[PDB]
Design a protein around this ligand. Structure first.
Ligand SMILES: CC(C)=CCC/C(C)=C\CC/C(C)=C/CC/C(C)=C\CC/C(C)=C/CC/C(C)=C/CC/C(C)=C/CC/C(C)=C/CC/C(C)=C\CC1=C(C)C(=O)c2ccccc2C1=O
Ligand SMILES: Nc1nc2c(ncn2[C@@H]2O[C@H](COP(=O)(O)OP(=O)(O)OP(=O)(O)O)[C@@H](O)[C@H]2O)c(=O)[nH]1
Ligand code: SF4
Ligand code: SF4
Ligand code: SF4
Ligand code: SF4
Ligand code: SF4
Ligand code: FES
Lengths: 183, 110, 60, 220, 125, 782
């Protein structure tokens, strides 16, 4: 993309901020509800709430027009290939919201049949607790993702941010080693 | 019960089990932790869920956990009608037929 | 933690030594973690708690 | 057989599979027996249904087919002998007095401690005409998990025979195509068998992790 | 003569340490020297493999923000002539997905040093 | 023929052996009668009155735990008698009125017999509106056991155990009436080695383990069957671990081995693997410093060093290894290193011991069993202290003494508390004179009695000719001779080879037929024929520089008879490969170090002194690998396929080989060499390792160490007078190597003999004096 070839400075900064503002709005979800969390996405679209208020009313049926893949459900083993295919068939930029405990970590279903978290097959940008998450929680997670998108870098800034995030992530100890106050 | 702190065990129950009743405390502890133990047996119980007969075959081996729980979810059987209700019609008619079956895949797969 | 069906609570107890007491009685919850990516909001935990120490607020 | 069907033998008080948290309580031996044959005067319409079944089936055939009759919690379960399942199913469906037109499915259950009868298939049958309900129970050994498929009599058993094969490996021979329906065809093992592990992962926590419930202690 | 370059991807530094410990400077004296490139983030791993010059990639299936199996599928769908992929699976039942990821080999957690070394040798040979 | 009586419980008839208790008959029939004070292994006491049942012809309800079955008795429990149910529920109510509302904080919660039996046989709500009895809680009765008297139901199981099972009545029911309470005397701690069993025997949270306190509830424990790795008893156990850390090890239930008992060592000595000294990665020596190395680099370096060592290599296997691990060491040495220099004796030993083990132990499994010690009319202990070594042997011997009137005789310098608890008789012998006493006992009619038994400890090896004397005594009298080592893996090592003169299955090395048989079993051309060196020979050769390399697996050099020689040997050896679990003296001097999985993380099997197989699967799934696999892949790198990728493979290979079954090797027939004579200010040193001592596997458990017996130098009154010492005053025993100072205890020993704890803190006899038992040591006051 030529927007990436643009050199740093005020030009690239303004392109980044405009792209972030544009993409946070019109963040069309993919029509990809699973399990019971899908009912909560539909409720979020329902009149009591209004997903449309965030420009997200158009649930792109095809992955091509979808920007956000709200997994929103428990991913069974047989479904992981399908979910990955859908994610791939979306086009850049792509974001994944792991709505519900099942999508995020397998939730209550810690067994063979469930994948134990969407992130096992596609990069997850926001994790959303709840079983299901009530629509306000979904909107909260979506707004957090909007904030994340707004700050998303581009071009040389994207490369530098990737390198810096790598440098930071290489050092964080694993959760298993946070033994604070354990006997 | 509710309070300024939130939803939680009512203070009356807390007082009964932590201050006054030893048997009450034992019963709370056991029924909460491992729960009741159901006499060994094998039962089939059906209800009229919105999509048809939701059946439950449940088997207990006398323990505190269900030995075997199986749901005859009506959607699972109803989906066998898709071949009859879709074959011969258009894809648009297939959409309507499937919607009429009104499957809930959670009950289908379980 | 015992009653949680999703194993979403990890708790470890410790003695309420006289030099450092955190709760009445001889035990307190030194380490208490809820894995909200495993919590299903069932509420069995608060039903289980014998001290009303654990409640469920309306914050979500 | 005539004694109640022992499905598991638990040793020691407090329903503990392991050696015992407290010494001296592990010596109790209590067999876990599912109810045996009911005395003949079955309650309600069960008596009539069995009388009709024994009338339509010959006395010899009735003896060969019906292994047990269990009236538990006012519910009738005919422990039908394998092989004869299609015959009794046809009799129940077609006979005007029985007329169990609606077979509700096939449920698999596993009894690894039930020698020669580890796998059980349960057929909940309902007669809307007479408004009656019964269950058929067919037992197959783990070594020979074959059972006659009722597809000819009750087409609905398709996707139920397939599901129970997927989750238990019960081979419903004669089934048009006994392929896996829930698990991928490439899957290894039959998940709902008791020997099949739960397959969970430890739940992570800062500084710790909780193994899956199947690995941890239990007092069933 | 070229030092084989191996990409080790895992959010957990201890999994990377274990991988880099089971494998050493040389898997065997008959094999070339080994150089390790640790990556903790999926974007960084994708960028590294885009630059190419890798003989093997070890992807942790348990990686938190982006699991290893997803990265394996992505790299085999995105990088032409990508190196063989070895995936670390967090459980036995993940084996099926390990096949779906098309990773040339799968090694369950906890990482058995000898099993990992043998799989790596088989992939490099 | 056992007499079967028959009776009806409820309405079901059953036949049981005469003398059976009603509670046991109900158990066999499947009726769950509530019980607190009853214990199958304790003599019935009928205290709690919880097990009351209605018996026809008796006005009162009868405690089923005290009622012997009768040939026509009619019994109806709470399931079929309103009177019995009412009695049991009233007893439960009276049991709960004074109980504390402590279930949330009680350690026993979730696994409490009181909770379960109150649910099953108790009322739903209290009627006790009055004031509850209260005690200060929790008071400590020892360094390990906390006592919460308020929860005590006064079932006396703790006291009844500490009196009957273990002869250690340091806890008893104090006070009277409602004030009655289990307690220690004033401050004298509960000193039993089996004190932990009282924690597992308490039906409530009264007695609790201070280590396990508040660590976990039953639901979050991963619990696995296990075998204790400490000594040769091979007790079945249940290892409970939370978040990958072992929290406790309960006694399990193996009627044929340990019934339901442990010693404190097995119960609590599990922290050794987590004290921070564990080796986590392979280590390599470079520039004189030991630094972490990749598995590949370490394996390559070790293979290169061992190949450059050709056949000049020794293999010290140690006694910790499982049977499979010992077999791996033997196979590696005799196939890869092509040497017979394999020795598991990381302790005082002799060639006579090797000959005796080959002739009378190897291949001869299950010859004597615990069930037979329980019935042997006479038991002769030679060089063996059942309490200090193999405590469950002591428990079985005490059981036999109490029930079947077993007579125990000990050829020991003095009567240890264990021997006193066995009611045994000492044959006072200065160490080194054991052969004399054993030969002199040929005419003892007590041994002539059928089923008589001789138990020979490993220490008897240190006395020249003593094992030969014991074999002669067994042959003459016909008493079955059984050899009981300290460490768990020693018998497995014998069955797996690991000795210079033995091949797997007791197959002698000095036998062409046996050698060819094993070679065929291993798919190898031929095995080494040169005689193997023992541990002492290997160490002496290495110290002289004639040994090219050493393969040391789990050996504490301090445990060797001459640890200075051992360190000199390992240092002078050009190349040292360590298969070690924790940083040790060998590790500090090794060129390559390989971390090996601890017992809790590895599959395998031990062989108790009976030769009984004691299998166990891993409890902690971890990347750590056994000695077996490390050796297998080291051999693979060396280019020889050990064919032992896993413990299952080793077990299968050993089964395929089977026992020798041919010509058994000759008896040791060693001569009874003259004992050294101690002059003025000198005494012959006696010693044996205390159960709770400075053993490495006991590290990380300060409470257990605190429970250890007080170290004291024990002397005869005359000997103490000769040196000018007084009872309780410090006494120093010294040799050119060094000195050991301990408080003196007059013990009515033979004159001129001084006894020390072999490895108790501040004693370390091998480390400090550099001599074993039977040596002459200068004695002095202060
Ligand atoms: C090109 C250029 C630069 C030119 C220069 C000038 C310039 C800049 C612009 C020129 C003009 C242009 C080109 C403008 C751009 C915009 C444009 C062209 C148009 C796009 C925007 C557009 C078409 C807007 C209107 C479309 C519209 C009305 C959309 C709303 C659609 C609605 C109502 C969607 C909601 C549907 C919904 C509730 C979805 C939930 C379903 C999901 C996800 C769950 C899945 C699911 C389902 C569906 C079950 O059935 C179910 C049943 C039972 C259990 C479970 C489930 C389950 O899991
Ligand atoms: N190779 C190997 N070494 C082990 C194993 N288990 C323990 N060790 C090590 O072996 C060394 C020697 O143990 P021991 O001489 O028996 O010391 P101890 O067991 O504490 O004391 P005693 O057994 O009473 O003599 C210790 O330093 C341990 O680190 C094992 O399974 N394999
Ligand atoms: S998180 Fe809860 S509501 Fe959402 S799919 Fe999973 S189980 Fe259903
Ligand atoms: S709401 Fe409480 S009890 Fe229920 S799953 Fe979440 S943490 Fe566990
Ligand atoms: S001993 Fe049993 S009844 Fe008493 S407080 Fe502890 S768990 Fe509760
Ligand atoms: S301390 Fe435990 S074993 Fe001892 S009398 Fe009290 S309840 Fe019984
Ligand atoms: S007697 Fe020996 S085997 Fe038994 S628990 Fe104690 S140390 Fe372990
Ligand atoms: S158990 Fe029999 S009276 Fe106590």
């Amino acid at each position: 993309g030529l927007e990436e070839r643009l050199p740093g400075g005020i030009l690239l900064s303004t392109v980044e901020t405009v792209a972030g503002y544009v993409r946070k709005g019109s963040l069309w979800p993919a029509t990809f509800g699973l399990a019971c969390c899908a009912i909560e996405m539909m409720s979020t679209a329902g009149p009591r709430f209004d997903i449309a208020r965030f420009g997200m009313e158009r649930f792109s049926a095809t992955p091509r027009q979808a920007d956000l893949m709200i997994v929103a459900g428990r991913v069974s083993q047989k479904m992981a290939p399908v979910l990955r295919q859908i994610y791939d068939q979306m086009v850049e930029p792509k974001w994944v919201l792991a709505m519900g405990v099942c999508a995020s970590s397998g939730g209550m279903f810690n067994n063979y049949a469930v994948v134990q978290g969407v992130d096992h097959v596609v990069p997850v940008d926001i994790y959303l607790p709840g079983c299901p998450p009530r629509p306000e929680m979904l909107l909260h997670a979506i707004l957090k993702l909007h904030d994340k998108i707004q700050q998303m870098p581009l071009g040389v800034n994207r490369e530098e941010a990737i390198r810096e995030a790598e440098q930071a992530a290489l050092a964080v100890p694993p959760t298993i080693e946070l033994k604070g106050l354990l006997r | 019960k509710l309070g300024p702190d939130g939803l939680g065990n009512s203070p009356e129950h807390i007082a009964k089990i932590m201050g006054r009743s030893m048997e009450g405390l034992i019963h709370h502890f056991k029924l909460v932790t491992e729960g009741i133990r159901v006499p060994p047996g094998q039962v089939y119980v059906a209800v009229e869920s919105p999509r048809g007969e939701l059946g439950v075959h449940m088997v207990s081996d006398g323990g505190t956990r269900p030995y075997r729980v199986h749901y005859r979810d009506p959607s699972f059987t109803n989906l066998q009608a898709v071949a009859a209700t879709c074959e011969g019609g258009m894809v648009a008619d297939a959409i309507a037929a499937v919607a009429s079956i009104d499957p809930v895949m959670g009950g289908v797969d379980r | 933690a015992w009653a949680c069906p999703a194993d979403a609570i990890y708790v470890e107890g410790a003695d309420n030594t006289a030099d450092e007491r955190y709760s009445p009685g001889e035990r307190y919850g030194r380490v208490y973690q809820i894995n909200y990516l495993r919590c299903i909001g069932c509420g069995l935990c608060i039903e289980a708690c014998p001290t009303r120490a654990l409640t469920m607020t309306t914050e979500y | 057989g005539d004694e109640p069907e022992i499905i598991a033998v638990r040793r020691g008080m407090f329903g503990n599979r392991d050696t015992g948290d407290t010494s001296g309580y592990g010596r109790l031996v209590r067999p876990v027996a599912l109810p045996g044959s009911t005395p003949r005067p079955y309650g309600g319409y069960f008596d009539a249904v069995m009388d009709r079944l024994a009338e339509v089936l010959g006395e010899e055939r009735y003896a060969m087919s019906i292994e047990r009759v269990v009236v538990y919690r006012d519910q009738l379960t005919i422990e039908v002998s394998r092989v004869q399942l299609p015959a009794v199913a046809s009799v129940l469906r077609d006979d005007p007095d029985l007329r169990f037109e609606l077979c509700l499915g096939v449920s698999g259950v596993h009894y690894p401690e039930d020698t020669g009868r580890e796998l059980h298939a349960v057929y909940p049958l309902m007669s809307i005409t007479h408004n009656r309900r019964i269950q058929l129970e067919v037992a197959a050994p783990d070594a020979d998990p074959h059972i006659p498929s009722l597809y000819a009599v009750y087409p609905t058993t398709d996707w139920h025979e397939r599901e129970t094969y997927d989750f238990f490996g019960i081979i419903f021979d004669g089934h048009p195509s006994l392929t896996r329906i829930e698990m991928p065809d490439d899957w290894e093992g039959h998940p709902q068998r008791k020997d099949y592990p739960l397959g969970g992962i430890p739940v992570e926590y800062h500084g710790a992790q909780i193994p899956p419930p199947d690995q941890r202690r239990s007092y069933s | 003569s070229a030092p084989l370059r191996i990409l080790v991807y895992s959010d957990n530094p201890r999994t990377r340490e274990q991988v880099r410990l089971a494998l050493g400077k040389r898997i065997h004296p008959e094999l070339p020297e080994i150089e390790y490139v640790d990556v903790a983030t999926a974007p960084m791993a994708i960028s590294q493999m885009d630059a190419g010059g890798f003989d093997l990639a070890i992807l942790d299936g348990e990686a938190t923000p982006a699991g290893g199996m997803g990265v394996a599928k992505q790299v085999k769908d995105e990088i032409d002539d990508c190196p063989p992929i070895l995936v670390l699976t967090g459980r036995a039942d993940d084996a099926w997905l390990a096949k779906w990821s098309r990773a040339e080999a799968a090694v369950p957690h906890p990482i058995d040093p000898i099993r990992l070394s043998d799989a790596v040798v088989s992939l490099l040979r | 023929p056992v007499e079967m009586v028959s009776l009806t419980i409820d309405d079901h008839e059953i036949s049981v052996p005469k003398g059976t208790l009603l509670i046991r008959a109900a158990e066999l029939m499947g009726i769950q009668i509530p019980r607190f004070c009853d214990h199958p292994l304790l003599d019935p006491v009928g205290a709690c009155r919880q097990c009351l049942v209605e018996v026809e012809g008796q006005r009162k309800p009868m405690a089923s735990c005290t009622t012997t079955v009768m040939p026509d008795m009619v019994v109806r429990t709470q399931f079929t008698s309103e009177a019995a149910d009412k009695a049991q529920r009233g007893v439960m109510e009276l049991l709960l009125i004074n109980h504390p509302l402590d279930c949330p904080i009680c350690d026993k919660g979730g696994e409490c017999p009181l909770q379960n039996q109150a649910m099953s046989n108790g009322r739903p709500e209290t009627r006790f509106e009055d004031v509850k009895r209260t005690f200060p809680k929790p008071i400590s009765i020892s360094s390990q056991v906390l006592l919460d008297r308020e929860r005590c139901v006064l079932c006396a199981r703790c006291t009844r155990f500490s009196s009957q099972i273990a002869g250690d009545p340091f806890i008893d029911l104090m006070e009277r009436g409602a004030l009655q309470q289990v307690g220690i005397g004033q401050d004298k701690p509960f000193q039993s080695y089996f004190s932990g069993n009282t924690v597992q025997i308490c039906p409530v949270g009264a007695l609790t383990g201070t280590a396990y306190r508040f660590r976990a509830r039953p639901f979050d424990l991963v619990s696995s069957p296990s075998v204790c790795e400490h000594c040769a008893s091979g007790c079945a156990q249940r290892t409970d671990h939370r978040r990958g850390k072992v929290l406790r090890r309960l006694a399990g239930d193996e009627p044929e081995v340990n019934e339901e008992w442990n010693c404190d060592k097995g119960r609590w000595a599990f922290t050794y693997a987590t004290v921070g000294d564990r080796i986590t990665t392979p280590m390599l020596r470079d520039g004189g410093v030991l630094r972490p190395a990749s598995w590949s680099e370490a394996l390559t370096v070790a293979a290169a060093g061992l190949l450059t060592a050709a056949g000049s290599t020794g293999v010290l296997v140690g006694g910790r290894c499982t049977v499979e691990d010992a077999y791996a060491y033997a196979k590696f040495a005799r196939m890869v290193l092509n040497t017979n220099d394999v020795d598991f004796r990381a302790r005082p030993h002799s060639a006579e011991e090797a000959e005796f083990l080959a002739a009378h132990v190897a291949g001869q499994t299950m010859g004597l069993r615990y069930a037979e010690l329980e019935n042997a009319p006479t038991v002769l202990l030679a060089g063996f202290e059942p309490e200090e070594e193999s405590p469950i042997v002591f428990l079985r011997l005490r059981k036999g003494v109490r029930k079947n009137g077993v007579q125990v005789v000990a050829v020991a310098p003095w009567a240890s508390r264990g021997l006193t608890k066995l009611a045994g008789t000492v044959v006072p012998t200065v160490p080194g004179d054991e052969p004399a006493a054993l030969d002199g006992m040929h005419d003892d009619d007590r041994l002539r009695r059928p089923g008589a038994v001789i138990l020979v400890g490993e220490r008897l090896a240190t006395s020249p000719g003593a094992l030969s004397a014991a074999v002669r005594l067994a042959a003459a009298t016909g008493a079955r001779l059984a050899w009981i080592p300290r460490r768990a893996g020693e018998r497995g090592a014998i069955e797996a080879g690991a000795l210079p003169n033995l091949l797997p299955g007791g197959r002698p090395v000095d036998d062409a037929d046996a050698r060819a048989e094993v070679a065929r079993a291993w798919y190898i051309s031929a095995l080494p024929e040169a005689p193997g060196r023992d541990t002492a020979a290997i160490l002496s050769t290495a110290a002289s520089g004639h040994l090219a390399a050493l393969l040391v697996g789990g050996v504490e050099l301090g445990d060797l008879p001459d640890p200075e020689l051992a360190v000199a040997a390992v240092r002078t050896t050009p190349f040292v490969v360590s298969l070690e679990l924790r940083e040790s003296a060998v590790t500090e001097l090794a060129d390559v170090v390989f971390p090996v999985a601890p017992v809790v993380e590895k599959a395998g099997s031990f062989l108790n002194w009976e030769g009984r197989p004691r299998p166990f699967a891993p409890s902690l799934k971890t990347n750590a690998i056994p000695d077996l696999r490390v050796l297998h892949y080291l051999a693979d790198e060396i280019g020889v396929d050990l064919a032992l990728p896993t413990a299952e493979a080793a077990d299968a290979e050993l089964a395929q080989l089977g026992t020798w079954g041919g010509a058994r090797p000759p008896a040791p027939t060693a001569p009874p060499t003259a004992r050294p004579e101690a002059g003025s200010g000198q005494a012959v040193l006696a010693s044996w390792r205390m159960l709770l001592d400075a053993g490495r596997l006991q590290d990380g458990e300060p409470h257990l160490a605190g429970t250890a017996v007080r170290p004291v130098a024990r002397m005869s009154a005359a000997t103490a007078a000769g040196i000018g010492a007084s009872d309780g005053a410090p006494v120093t025993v010294s040799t050119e190597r060094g000195a050991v100072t301990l408080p003196l205890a007059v013990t009515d020993m033979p004159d001129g003999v001084v006894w020390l704890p072999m490895n108790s803190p501040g004693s370390a006899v091998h480390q400090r004096l550099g001599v074993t038992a039977g040596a002459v040591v200068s004695i002095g006051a202060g």
